[PDB]
Amino acid sequence: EDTPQFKIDIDQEKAQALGVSINDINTTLGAAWGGSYVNDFIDRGRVKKVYVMSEAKYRMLPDDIGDWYVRAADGQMVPFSAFSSSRWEYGSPRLE
Amino acid sequence: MPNFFIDRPIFAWVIAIIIMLAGGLAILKLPVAQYPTIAPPAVTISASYPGADAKTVQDTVTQVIEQNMNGIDNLMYMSSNSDSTGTVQITLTFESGTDADIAQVQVQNKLQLAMPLLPQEVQQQGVSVEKSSSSFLMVVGVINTDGTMTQEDISDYVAANMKDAISRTSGVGDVQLFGSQYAMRIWMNPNELNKFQLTPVDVITAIKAQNAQVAAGQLGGTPPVKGQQLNASIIAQTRLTSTEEFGKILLKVNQDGSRVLLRDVAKIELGGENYDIIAEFNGQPASGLGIKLATGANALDTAAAIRAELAKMEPFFPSGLKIVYPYDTTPFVKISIHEVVKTLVEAIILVFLVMYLFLQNFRATLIPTIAVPVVLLGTFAVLAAFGFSINTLTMFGMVLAIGLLVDDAIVVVENVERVMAEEGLPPKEATRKSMGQIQGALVGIAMVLSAVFVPMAFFGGSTGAIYRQFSITIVSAMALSVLVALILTPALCATMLKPIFNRMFEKSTHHYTDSVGGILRSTGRYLVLYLIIVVGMAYLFVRLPSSFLPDEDQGVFMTMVQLPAGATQERTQKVLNEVTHYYLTKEKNNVESVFAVNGFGFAGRGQNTGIAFVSLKDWADRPGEENKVEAITMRATRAFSQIKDAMVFAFNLPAIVELGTATGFDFELIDQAGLGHEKLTQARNQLLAEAAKHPDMLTSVRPNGLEDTPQFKIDIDQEKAQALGVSINDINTTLGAAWGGSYVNDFIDRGRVKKVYVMSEAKYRMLPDDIGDWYVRAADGQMVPFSAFSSSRWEYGSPRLERYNGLPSMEILGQAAPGKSTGEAMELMEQLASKLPTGVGYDWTGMSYQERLSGNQAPSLYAISLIVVFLCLAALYESWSIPFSVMLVVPLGVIGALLAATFRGLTNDVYFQVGLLTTIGLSAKNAILIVEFAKDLMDKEGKGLIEATLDAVRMRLRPILMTSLAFILGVMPLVISTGAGSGAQNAVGTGVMGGMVTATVLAIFFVPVFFVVVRRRF
Amino acid sequence: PGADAKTVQDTVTQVIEQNMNGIDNLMYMSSNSDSTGTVQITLTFESGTDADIAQVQVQNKLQLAMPLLPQEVQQQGVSVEKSSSSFLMVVGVINT
Amino acid sequence: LPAGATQERTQKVLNEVTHYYLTKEKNNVESVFAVNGFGFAGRGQNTG
Amino acid sequence: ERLSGNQAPSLYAISLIVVFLCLAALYESWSIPFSVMLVVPLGVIGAL
Amino acid sequence: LGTATGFDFELIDQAGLGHEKLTQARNQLLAEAAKHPDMLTSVRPNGL
Cα atoms in the 13 Å half-sphere on the side-chain side of B152: 12
Cα atoms in the 13 Å half-sphere on the side-chain side of B811: 19
The total number of residues shown for chain E amounts to: 48
Cβ distance B697 to B825 under 8 Å? yes
Reported as type and span, the H/E element at residue B714 is: strand B709-716
Using an 8 Å CB-CB cutoff, list chain C residues near B233: 4, 35
Picking from B5, B6, B10 by the largest number of E CB atoms within 10 A of its own CB, the best residue to mutate is B10
- Residue among B408, B510, B507 nearest B449 (CA): B408
How many other C-beta atoms are found inside a 10 Å radius of the C-beta of residue B681?
Answer: 17
Reported as type and span, the H/E element at residue B539 is: helix B525-542
Using an 8 Å CB-CB cutoff, list chain C residues near B101: 53, 56-57, 60
| CA pair distance B480, B489, nearest whole angstrom | 12
| CA pair distance B334, B347, nearest whole angstrom | 20
Helix/strand/coil for B674: coil
D30 to chain C nearest CA, in Å? 14
HEC profile for B324-371? EEEEECHHHHHHHHHHHHHHHHHHHHHHHHHHHHHCCCHHHHHHHHHH
> What contacts C49, CB < 8 A, 6 or more positions away?
C24, C25
| CA pair distance F42, F30, nearest whole angstrom | 10
Residue type at F10 in one-letter notation: E
Provide the edge-to-edge strand list for the sheet that holds A94-95.
A94-95, C26-34, C39-45
Reported as type and span, the H/E element at residue B948 is: helix B947-975
Buried-exposed string F3-41: b where 16+ CB fall within 10 A, e elsewhere = eeeeeeeeeeeeeeeeeeeeeeeeeeeeeebeeeeeeee
Which chain D residues have any C-beta within 8 angstroms of a chain C C-beta?
A: 33, 42-44
- DSSP conformation class of C12: I
Using an 8 Å CB-CB cutoff, list chain B residues near D8: 224, 226-228
Using an 8 Å CB-CB cutoff, list chain B residues near D6: 220, 224, 228-231
Give, in degrees to the nearest 5, the angle at Cα B766 between B765 and B768.
Answer: 90
| CA pair distance B110, B102, nearest whole angstrom | 12
| CA pair distance B77, B98, nearest whole angstrom | 13
| CA pair distance A75, A72, nearest whole angstrom | 5
B224 to chain D nearest CA, in Å? 8
Cβ distance B812 to B705 under 8 Å? no
Which chain A residues have any C-beta within 8 angstroms of a chain F C-beta?
A: 44-46
DSSP state letters, chain A = ----EEEEEE-HHHHHHHT--HHHHHHHHIIIII-EEEEEEEETTEEEEEEE---GGGSSSGGGGTT-EEE-SSS-EEEGGGSEEEEEE---SEE-
| Residue C30 bridge partners (DSSP) | C42
Peptide bond preceding B223: is omega within 30 degrees of 0, i.e. cis?
Answer: yes
Count Cβ atoms within 10 A of the Cβ of residue B236 and give its class: 0-12 exposed, 13-18 middle, 19 or more buried: buried
In chain A, the residue whose alpha carbon lies closest to the alpha carbon of F17 is: A44
Picking from C63, C78, C80 by the largest number of B CB atoms within 10 A of its own CB, the best residue to mutate is C63
Beta strands in B798-954, from DSSP E residues, in sequence order: 800-804, 807-816, 840-844
Cβ distance B279 to B573 under 8 Å? no
| CA pair distance B846, B39, nearest whole angstrom | 10
How many other C-beta atoms are found inside a 10 Å radius of the C-beta of residue B45?
Answer: 24
| Residue C45 bridge partners (DSSP) | C26
Using an 8 Å CB-CB cutoff, list chain A residues near C6: 91-92, 95
Beta strands B667-671 and B289-293, pairing class? unpaired
- Residue among B256, B246, B257, B254 nearest B203 (CA): B246
F10 to chain A nearest CA, in Å? 19
Give, in degrees to the nearest 5, the angle at Cα A87 between A85 and A90.
Answer: 150
What does R_g of chain A's alpha carbons equal in angstroms? 16
| CA pair distance B43, B732, nearest whole angstrom | 34
Sign of the C-alpha dihedral computed for residues B665, B666, B672 and B673 taken in this order? positive
C5 to chain A nearest CA, in Å? 6
Cβ distance B383 to B473 under 8 Å? yes
- Residue among B61, B160, B79 nearest B117 (CA): B61
Reported as type and span, the H/E element at residue B378 is: helix B362-386
DSSP state letters, C36-88 = TS-EEEEEEEPTT--HHHHHHHHHHHHTTTTTTS-HHHHHH--------SS-S
How many other C-beta atoms are found inside a 10 Å radius of the C-beta of residue A91?
Answer: 18
Q: What are chain A's domains?
A: 3-91 (3.30.2090.10)
Using an 8 Å CB-CB cutoff, list chain B residues near A27: 214
Contact A5 B234 (CB under 8 A): yes
Using an 8 Å CB-CB cutoff, list chain D residues near C36: 43
> What contacts B605, CB < 8 A, 6 or more positions away?
B83, B85, B87, B276, B599
Buried-exposed string B307-326: b where 16+ CB fall within 10 A, e elsewhere = eebbeeeeeeeeeebebbbb
Using an 8 Å CB-CB cutoff, list chain F residues near A45: 16, 18
What does R_g of chain E's alpha carbons equal in angstroms? 13
| CA pair distance B915, B923, nearest whole angstrom | 12
F46 to chain A nearest CA, in Å? 22
Cβ distance B378 to B478 under 8 Å? no
The total number of residues shown for chain B amounts to: 1018
What φ, ψ does residue B322 adopt, rounded to 5°? Answer: -140, 170
Give, in degrees to the nearest 5, the angle at Cα B864 between B469 and B923.
Answer: 70
- Partner residue opposite C5 with nearest CB, options A30, A34, A94: A94
Cβ distance B120 to B208 under 8 Å? no
Contact B222 D7 (CB under 8 A): yes
A64 to chain F nearest CA, in Å? 42
Provide the edge-to-edge strand list for the sheet that holds B217-218.
A84-89, A5-10, B233-235, B217-218
Give, in degrees to the nearest 5, the angle at Cα B16 between B15 and B22.
Answer: 90
**Coarse DSSP helix, strand, coil percentages of chain B, rounded to the nearest 5 percent:** 55, 20, 30
A2 to chain D nearest CA, in Å? 7
Residue type at B75 in one-letter notation: L
- Partner residue opposite D44 with nearest CB, options A2, A4, A93: A93
Contact B231 D8 (CB under 8 A): no
Cβ distance B590 to B622 under 8 Å? yes
| Residue B807 bridge partners (DSSP) | B804
Contact A8 B228 (CB under 8 A): no
| Residue B314 bridge partners (DSSP) | none
The size of the B-D interface in CB pairs under 8 A is: 20
Contact A94 C6 (CB under 8 A): no
| CA pair distance B922, B928, nearest whole angstrom | 10
Give, in degrees to the nearest 5, the angle at Cα B324 between B318 and B329.
Answer: 150
- DSSP conformation class of B772: G
Using an 8 Å CB-CB cutoff, list chain E residues near B9: none
The size of the B-C interface in CB pairs under 8 A is: 58
- Residue among B556, B380, B546, B538 nearest B463 (CA): B546
In chain A, the residue whose alpha carbon lies closest to the alpha carbon of D43 is: A94
Chains C and F touch (3+ CB pairs under 8 A): no
Using an 8 Å CB-CB cutoff, list chain C residues near A95: 5-6, 9, 13, 32-34
Helix/strand/coil for B698: strand
How many other C-beta atoms are found inside a 10 Å radius of the C-beta of residue B60?
Answer: 18
Sign of the C-alpha dihedral computed for residues B298, B299, B305 and B309 taken in this order? positive
Cα atoms in the 13 Å half-sphere on the side-chain side of B238: 18
Contact C18 B164 (CB under 8 A): yes
| CA pair distance B224, B231, nearest whole angstrom | 9
